[PDB]
């Protein structure tokens, strides 16, 4: 019998956040299957955390460690995840990250594993895509000041190749991006790389539809992985060039069945049809949390001697079984919703994965190629013209 | 205190508040600065920052001052210096990844002016600037911002 | 040349098909052009007359 420390942000809404409901769904679906962990049940302790208060995250992590957990699941903010990473590196318990965060190269920590795909590999995929599309002047539009280091391999890319990068910043609201779009139209920009949330992507698509940007002359590339959850119905007949990446392996039938089984439980939560988004779709954060709980349970299955003990924040005795269980974490090869899962032996980041290059046609969103870190970019549609 | 142990920063800040101080002169290190900023803002303590850190815009802490000058105004000064020198090709060399968050509108300056730009990053080793300086010599780039 | 209801449906379908650029100068023979909601069709460079 084990416990997991779930830390999630609360809204004072009707339902919880999708990360917390995905955590509960992961626990229930793992405990239903007797194939995985037949001799040990799994429990959890959720904690509802505020907006950007890492001390409150430190206190709730201290309360969870006073209870004692097998592993913790950190929040989505950068500062609170840094505090939880420092606490779990000090006390030797594993820390699992779902949202990407900025990391400092001079931070000697080892008790953290993030299953988000690394933005260096994502930027290399974006570089492969823009070299296939043969642009010369690309406008990169980012959301916030943390967006540059997610694209820092792309901004270093015109050192090696001929490429122009006029980089513009989104304002404090998405609805006030009309002067940015007028400056975009006046400068004759035609190939725009967007790096923001999917909500900001829907907002900038509505703002561009008010601006008349969606013609045949415009190509849009999105670094966000929630492109498949967007609504492309009033954009598909306009004849545009929207192209993105889908980490979620929706081709498999069992994965689609699990997606439908989670989505029918999401139907208690009502949608907002004015936002330009769909409903009944698993987000990348929720799917990554589900796969994280699966990978942690796979790491538990190789450990028969597992015992959860209480710990104190005022004494720096580390947890007893931290090193062997962390060694069991970093050698996993579990096939989750996001395909293969394998972390880096030097950082622990998920820098090796599989990506679905989805694009937009008038039929709708459609996969046209695959991307991998080893062979680069395949492009099955362009691979059909392969001579003998 | 040691390097980049924000848990140790929270523990020693808790010990100093257990003693009780009028103010806290915080560290010059980003994760510990964020932890001490959360500690002091949640406890009503004045906290002083003397080195620049990356600041998240969504953070609602107002219980601190930063005596280091804000790097947006330094980037405005650097842009004014570059526009005074009438340059066209500028190479920017940065070591830590937060330098791009530091140098914001210098990167955003080709959208506003006719200033062509290229950046390069120093590697994690100090001595390995020789391939970078060899690339600077081979690129025939005469205006370097460090 | 149609009714204003058909004109509004035509303009909605043309905005959906990306016909709202600077390269379009539609002239409507109907006398109820002022009754249209032109707010989603603004900021697009069209020239309704
Ligand atoms: C307290 O904190 C607030 C918030 O940060 C500060 O307010 C900012 O102050 C800076 C001071 O430089 C302002 O920067 C200046 O903005 C002027 C207006 O910008 C226009 O254009 C931009 C881009 O399109 C728009 O986003 C903006 O809304 C305006 O339409 C610029 O004209 C200034 O440029 C001038 O000085 C630079 C110096 O390098 C020259 O190079 C230029 O040629 C030009 O002469 C400059 O960029 C910033 O806009 C303010 N933001 C806000 C939110 O107010 C306070 O200054 C700070 N302290 C004080 C005193 O309250
Ligand atoms: C754990 O993390 C480590 C740090 O990221 C990983 O090490 C790095 O892995 C990448 C994987 O692509 C290696 O590839 C990169 O560099 C090669 C070689 O470039 C050469 O010239 C550069 C200067 O121009 C040097 O800086 C390099 O060191 C090197 O001498 C590039 O060819 C790669 O790009 C190619 O591959 C990508 C992905 O398919 C494509 O998108 C590109 O188009 C291109 O085909 C990368 O830039 C990198 O060399 C390696 N080293 C480091 C520290 O960066 C490590 O692999 C990882 N391991 C695990 C287990 O995950
Ligand atoms: C992309 O734009 C080019 C412009 O010539 C067009 O030929 C091509 O069909 C477009 N593809 C997509 C994805 O719309
Ligand atoms: C690309 O996809 C095709 C699909 O048949 C596959 O055969 C090939 O091995 C893949 N790799 C390449 C060549 O990119
Ligand atoms: C359409 O209206 C705009 C309003 O500024 C005007 O400038 C333009 O000359 C008009 N005619 C066109 C675009 O043919």
From Swiss-Prot, chain C:
Domain of life, per lineage: Eukaryota
Expression across tissues: Highest expression is found in the olfactory lobe, piriform cortex, dentate gyrus, hippocampus, granular cell layer of the cerebellum, and in caudate-putamen.
Record PTM: Sumoylation mediates kainate receptor-mediated endocytosis and regulates synaptic transmission. Sumoylation is enhanced by PIAS3 and desumoylated by SENP1. Ubiquitinated. Ubiquitination regulates the GRIK2 levels at the synapse by leading kainate receptor degradation through proteasome.
List of glycosylated residues: 47
Compartments, record wording: Cell membrane; Postsynaptic cell membrane
Quaternary structure and partners: Homotetramer and heterotetramer with GRIK5. Tetramers may be formed by the dimerization of dimers. Assembles into a kainate-gated homomeric channel that does not bind AMPA. Can form functional heteromeric receptors with GRIK4 and GRIK5. Can form functional heteromeric receptors with GRIK3. Interacts with DLG4. Interacts with NETO2. Interacts (via C-terminus) with KLHL17 (via kelch repeats); the interaction targets GRIK2 for degradation via ubiquitin-proteasome pathway.
Similarity annotation: Belongs to the glutamate-gated ion channel (TC 1.A.10.1) family. GRIK2 subfamily.
Function: Ionotropic glutamate receptor that functions as a cation-permeable ligand-gated ion channel, gated by L-glutamate and the glutamatergic agonist kainic acid. L-glutamate acts as an excitatory neurotransmitter at many synapses in the central nervous system. Binding of the excitatory neurotransmitter L-glutamate induces a conformation change, leading to the opening of the cation channel, and thereby converts the chemical signal to an electrical impulse. The receptor then desensitizes rapidly and enters a transient inactive state, characterized by the presence of bound agonist. Independent of its ionotropic glutamate receptor activity, acts as a thermoreceptor conferring sensitivity to cold temperatures. Functions in dorsal root ganglion neurons.
Note: The postsynaptic actions of Glu are mediated by a variety of receptors that are named according to their selective agonists. This receptor binds domoate > kainate > quisqualate > glutamate. It does not bind AMPA without coexpression with GRIK5.
Protein name: Glutamate receptor ionotropic, kainate 2
Parent-protein start and end of this portion: 229 to 277 of 908
């Amino acid at each position: 019998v084990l416990r997991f420390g779930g830390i999630f942000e609360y809204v004072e809404s009707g339902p919880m956040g999708a990360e917390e409901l995905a955590f509960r769904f992961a626990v229930n679906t793992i405990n239903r299957n007797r194939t995985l962990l037949p001799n040990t049940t799994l429990t959890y302790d959720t904690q509802k955390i505020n907006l950007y208060d890492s001390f409150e995250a430190s206190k709730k992590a201290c309360d969870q460690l006073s209870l004692g957990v097998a592993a913790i699941f950190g929040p989505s903010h950068s500062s609170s995840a840094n505090a939880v990473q420092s606490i779990c590196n000090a006390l030797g318990v594993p820390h699992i990250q779902t949202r990407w965060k900025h990391q400092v190269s001079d931070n000697k920590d080892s008790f953290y594993v993030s299953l988000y795909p690394d933005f260096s590999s994502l930027s290399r995929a974006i570089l492969d895509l823009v070299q296939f599309f043969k642009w010369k002047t690309v406008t990169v539009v980012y959301d916030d000041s943390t967006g540059l280091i997610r694209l820092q391999e792309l901004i270093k890319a015109p050192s090696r190749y001929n490429l122009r990068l006029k980089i513009r910043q989104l304002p404090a609201d998405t609805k006030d991006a009309k002067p940015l779009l007028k400056e975009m139209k006046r400068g004759k920009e035609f190939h725009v790389i967007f790096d923001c949330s999917h909500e900001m992507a829907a907002g900038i698509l509505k703002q561009a539809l008010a601006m008349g940007m969606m013609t045949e002359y415009y190509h849009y590339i999105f670094t966000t992985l929630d492109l498949f959850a967007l609504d492309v119905e009033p954009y598909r007949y306009s004849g545009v060039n929207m192209t993105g990446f889908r980490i979620l392996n929706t081709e498999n039938t069992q994965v689609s069945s699990i997606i439908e089984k989670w989505s029918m439980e999401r139907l208690q939560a009502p949608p907002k049809p004015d936002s330009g988004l769909l409903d009944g779709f698993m987000t990348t954060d929720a799917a990554l949390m589900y796969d994280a709980v699966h990978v942690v349970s796979v790491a538990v299955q190789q450990f028969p001697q597992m015992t959860v003990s209480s710990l104190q924040c005022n004494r720096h005795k580390p947890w007893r079984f931290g090193t062997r269980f962390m060694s069991l974490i970093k050698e996993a090869h579990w096939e989750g919703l996001t395909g293969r899962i394998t972390f880096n032996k030097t950082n622990g980041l998920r820098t090796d994965f599989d990506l679905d290059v989805i694009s937009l046609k008038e039929e709708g969103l459609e996969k046209i190629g695959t991307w991998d870190p080893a062979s680069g970019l395949n492009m099955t549609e362009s691979q059909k013209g392969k001579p003998a």
